[PDB]
Homo-oligomer: A and B are copies of this chain.
Amino acid sequence: VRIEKDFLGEKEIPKDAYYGVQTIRATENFPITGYRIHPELIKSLGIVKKSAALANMEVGLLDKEVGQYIVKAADEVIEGKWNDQFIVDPIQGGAGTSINMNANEVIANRALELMGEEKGNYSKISPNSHVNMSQSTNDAFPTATHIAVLSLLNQLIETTKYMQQEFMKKADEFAGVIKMGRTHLQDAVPILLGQEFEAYARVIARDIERIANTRNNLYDINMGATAVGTGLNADPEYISIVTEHLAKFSGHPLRSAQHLVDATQNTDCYTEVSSALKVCMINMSKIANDLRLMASGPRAGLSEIVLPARQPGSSIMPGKVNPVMPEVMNQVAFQVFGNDLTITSASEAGQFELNVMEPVLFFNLIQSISIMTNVFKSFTENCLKGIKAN
């Protein structure tokens, strides 16, 4: 039970909460889904504010006492101590303002608490003046995303490389086994089961390439572009220092865009990643369809392979064994195709020097990378490893 001042009025924020009115206002405007932005987003949002204060202090804009406690409060956010304080819906108006401010206020209050000051006391440490210094919504939020995306994206590469490998092991394990090769679902010449499995592993290889390639256009950021991208009084030293600090703490080869308007209004580095992810899920779905057909039977199917039993067999009907792990892979592809349509749509919704539709674009981008990682990690383990011939 507390009090905080907003232009709309005053909301009763709990004494526990590190978020303020600016976040509670977003709870009323956007009670759309209920979800919470991905933990890797929050981490990257923390990396951005820490990177900011470190740079702000170094150029003489931020008071070295107040900032020192913003850095420490930001490091706590990087480590995920405060994921229950980020309560704004991923789908939201204002083009990320609410997500940016939810970071600003949580780090603002927690920085006051460490230095022995009250929560909500914004005369001491303001979430706008001190935490959001030398930065807009339109560069913190993007850059955080760029970082969140890349990091998730690297996790996806490894988990996908590991999957690709385990297709090749199963490729040679069935080099000898011989099945009927089929075109138009209609019997052709006999074919080695191992060839089919190499065929899968070569396209997964080909995706891994495409996905990894989509990172390079994510390394260019616009931190310091501020409101539009002309700079609008944005110090060249601040840009350079916070860029280099963002590259350290995040760990990606991050840069500064050669045109900060271009990096602020265009959203093509995202459609690009989502496009590579769609084509990967096109392929895995086909393969998932193959696996389900080859596993068909026992008596009225193809009975070429046997998948690990991962769900209990029919009550009294014998031989009933559903291929649930491929099935779930088909469904994640259906999300990713959709996700990509929403992303395409939100990208087209660009107008002039900003695209205010980023929240849903980034929600679906992150979700795409996340569900793929997980199904690949669950599929390979509880299916690809155990797959045996008949």
Which residues of A are in contact with B by a Cβ distance under 8 Å? Answer: 6-8, 22, 25-26, 28-33, 35, 91-95, 97-98, 128-129, 132, 136-138, 179-189, 191-192, 195-196, 198-199, 202-203, 206-207, 210, 213, 217, 226-230, 232, 259, 261-262, 265-266, 268, 271-272, 275-276, 278-279, 282-283, 285-286, 289-290, 292-293, 295-302, 309-317, 319-328, 330-335, 337-357, 359-361, 364, 367, 370-371, 374-375, 377-378, 382
Q: List 26 A-B contacts (CB under 8 A).
A: A7-B312, A7-B313, A8-B310, A28-B378, A94-B184, A128-B315, A137-B316, A180-B299, A181-B229, A181-B353, A183-B227, A183-B322, A186-B296, A186-B301, A187-B320, A189-B317, A191-B230, A198-B262, A275-B275, A275-B278, A279-B347, A282-B347, A286-B348, A330-B346, A333-B345, A339-B342
Report the minimum CB–CB distance from A134 to chain B (whole Å).
10
Are A327's CB and B93's CB within 8 A? yes
Report the minimum CB–CB distance from A343 to chain B (whole Å).
8
Are B33's CB and A371's CB within 8 A? yes
Are A312's CB and B6's CB within 8 A? yes
Report the minimum CB–CB distance from A152 to chain B (whole Å).
14
A198-B261, A268-B203, A352-B293 as given contacts; A316 in contact with B187, CB under 8 Å? no
Kindly identify which residue among B97, B349, B354, B371 contacts A32, using a CB–CB cutoff of 8 Å: B371
Kindly identify which residue among B289, B292, B309 contacts A8, using a CB–CB cutoff of 8 Å: B309
A266-B283, A338-B345, A352-B182 as given contacts; A229 in contact with B191, CB under 8 Å? yes
Indicate how many identical chains form the complex: 4
Are B92's CB and A328's CB within 8 A? yes
With a 10 A CB-CB cut-off, give which of A35, A344, A351 has the most chain B CB atoms. Answer: A344
Report the minimum CB–CB distance from A209 to chain B (whole Å).
9
With a 10 A CB-CB cut-off, give which of A188, A299, A343 has the most chain B CB atoms. Answer: A188
Are A286's CB and B93's CB within 8 A? no
Q: How far is the CA of A350 from the CA of B309 in the complex (A)?
A: 22
With a 10 A CB-CB cut-off, give which of A348, A351, A359 has the most chain B CB atoms. Answer: A348
Q: How far is the CA of A98 from the CA of B325 in the complex (A)?
A: 13
In the complex, chain B residues whose CB is within 8 Å of the CB of A320: 184, 186-188
Q: How far is the CA of A272 from the CA of B275 in the complex (A)?
A: 8
In the complex, chain B residues whose CB is within 8 Å of the CB of A349: 286, 289, 330, 334
Q: How far is the CA of A207 from the CA of B247 in the complex (A)?
A: 25
Report the minimum CB–CB distance from A138 to chain B (whole Å).
7
Are B352's CB and A94's CB within 8 A? no
Are B328's CB and A268's CB within 8 A? no
In the complex, chain B residues whose CB is within 8 Å of the CB of A331: 91-93, 346, 357, 359-360
A198-B259, A261-B198 as given contacts; A279 in contact with B286, CB under 8 Å? no
In the complex, chain B residues whose CB is within 8 Å of the CB of A129: 315
Are A311's CB and B180's CB within 8 A? no
Report the minimum CB–CB distance from A277 to chain B (whole Å).
10
Are A313's CB and B132's CB within 8 A? no
* 12 more CB-based (< 8 A) A-B contacts, given A32-B378, A138-B316: A8-B310, A30-B328, A32-B332, A180-B299, A181-B228, A184-B327, A188-B353, A195-B259, A332-B360, A334-B360, A335-B364, A338-B343
Q: How far is the CA of A321 from the CA of B7 in the complex (A)?
A: 11
Report the minimum CB–CB distance from A270 to chain B (whole Å).
10
